[PDB]
């Protein structure tokens, strides 16, 4: 069993909580408390390896908690999530990446760019621009739908694979 510490970041309403709950518990959730920042644990098999995922589903917080501080110190990879129908959430991505680099004091932090809500045919964010933003960063771009489940495992499993790539290097 190998432990991986992941952190899910992104603007309010992009689907961080929905993605986390769909991954862990197999439910699509319409209204999960937007203020709750909680940690979840799931045992999954990825490429034949038994992985223990510790996932921080982040939220807007007024105080900097002991739980958040554990992930600040030992979090290994980040999912930077935007919604394909919210331009402002895509514009925040570069700020999330810049901040993660400073938090970890590293130009090489395992990260995946996630474009959520791809079940909606209405796209305000050009997915070609997202794939080019990810290419510019040297990271994978994954499309997801917490509603249909498409890409959900792919987003988190790709992040675990990026962490492995970082550990071996």
């Amino acid at each position, epitope marked *: 069993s190998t432990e991986y510490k992941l952190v899910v970041v992104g603007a309010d309403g992009v689907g961080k909580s929905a993605l986390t709950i769909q991954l862990i*518990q197999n439910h699509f*959730v*319409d*209204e*999960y*408390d937007p203020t*709750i920042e*909680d940690s979840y644990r799931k045992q999954v098999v990825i490429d034949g390896e038994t992985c223990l995922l510790d996932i921080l589903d982040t939220a807007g917080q007024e105080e900097y908690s002991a739980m958040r501080d554990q992930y600040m110190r030992t979090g290994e990879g980040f999912l930077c999530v935007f919604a394909i129908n919210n331009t402002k959430s895509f514009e925040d991505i570069h700020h999330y990446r810049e901040q993660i680099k400073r938090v970890k004091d590293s130009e090489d932090v395992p990260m995946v760019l996630v474009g959520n809500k791809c079940d909606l045919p209405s796209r305000t964010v050009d997915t070609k621009q997202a794939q080019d933003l990810a290419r510019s960063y040297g990271i994978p771009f994954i499309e997801t739908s917490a509603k249909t489940r498409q890409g959900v495992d792919d987003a988190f499993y790709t992040l675990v694979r990026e962490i492995r790539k970082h550990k071996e290097k």
Partner: antibody
Framework: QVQLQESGPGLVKPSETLSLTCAVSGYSISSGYYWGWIRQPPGKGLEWIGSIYHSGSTYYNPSLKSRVTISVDTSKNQFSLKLSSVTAADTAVYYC?????????????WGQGTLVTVSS | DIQMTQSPSSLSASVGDRVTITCRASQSISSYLNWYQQKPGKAPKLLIYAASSLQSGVPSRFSGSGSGTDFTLTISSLQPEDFATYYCQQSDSYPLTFGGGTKVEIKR
């Protein structure tokens, strides 16, 4: 201000379907919250049956799932329960209640409860 | 399912006594535990949510404590009107589950 009230037949024959409605006042089901059904057999504890969101998304007690249908009517501001193939084990006071969020929340307020007896 | 075990199933205590009822979860639920009070012929009423937050309007003699798998509801000075069955309920995850209840009666 927010009030919930159950209604429906107090007598159901074995094998037939139990139907109840919860009339909501002081708040619109279409605005938010999860809307649930909880039951209490005479002299026993509480058992959560299921909950629904205004979108139609339903969550169930796994031991009752195959028999439960929960529905919402946002125009009438009501929600309902259908429990098929009833037996004497379904004789209970049925309560409706609401909770703000899907999880990590609480039920408040609750209806007054309505007794349903399964008998021929 | 997360099983909730309450103890004791019933107790008798005098007016003014401190009463403690326990709730144990089969796995960790952090602070996602609520307590309801049920009087005869009435619906359960929320007293405490999130393990220790007192519902507005509820008398200060009621308090809740605990986290993880072990929780307690305490009535610091039992009053005659506190005769009820008390139920805990985990709100961490589905299916939503309740403890079996604790019936509190007054010794007079």
């Amino acid at each position: 201000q927010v009030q919930l009230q159950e209604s429906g037949p107090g007598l159901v024959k074995p094998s037939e379907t139990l139907s109840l409605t919860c009339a909501v006042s002081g708040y619109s089901i279409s605005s938010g919250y999860y809307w649930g059904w909880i039951r209490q057999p005479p002299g026993k504890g509480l058992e959560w049956i299921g909950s629904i969101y205004h979108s139609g998304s339903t969550y169930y007690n796994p031991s009752l799932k195959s028999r439960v249908t929960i529905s919402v009517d946002t125009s009438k501001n009501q929600f309902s329960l259908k429990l098929s193939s009833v037996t004497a084990a379904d004789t209970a006071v049925y309560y409706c209640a609401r909770q703000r969020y899907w999880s990590k929340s609480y039920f408040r307020p609750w209806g007054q409860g309505t007794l349903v007896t399964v008998s021929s | 399912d997360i099983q909730m075990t309450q103890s004791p199933s019933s107790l008798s205590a005098s007016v003014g006594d401190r009463v403690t009822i326990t709730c144990r979860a089969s796995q960790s639920i952090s602070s996602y535990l609520n307590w309801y009070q049920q009087k005869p012929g009435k619906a359960p009423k929320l007293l405490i949510y999130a393990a220790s937050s007192l519902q507005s309007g509820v008398p200060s003699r009621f308090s809740g404590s605990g986290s993880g798998t072990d929780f307690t509801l305490t009535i610091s000075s039992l009053q005659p009107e506190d005769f009820a069955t008390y139920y805990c309920q985990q709100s961490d995850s589905y299916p939503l589950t309740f403890g079996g209840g604790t019936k509190v009666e007054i010794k007079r």
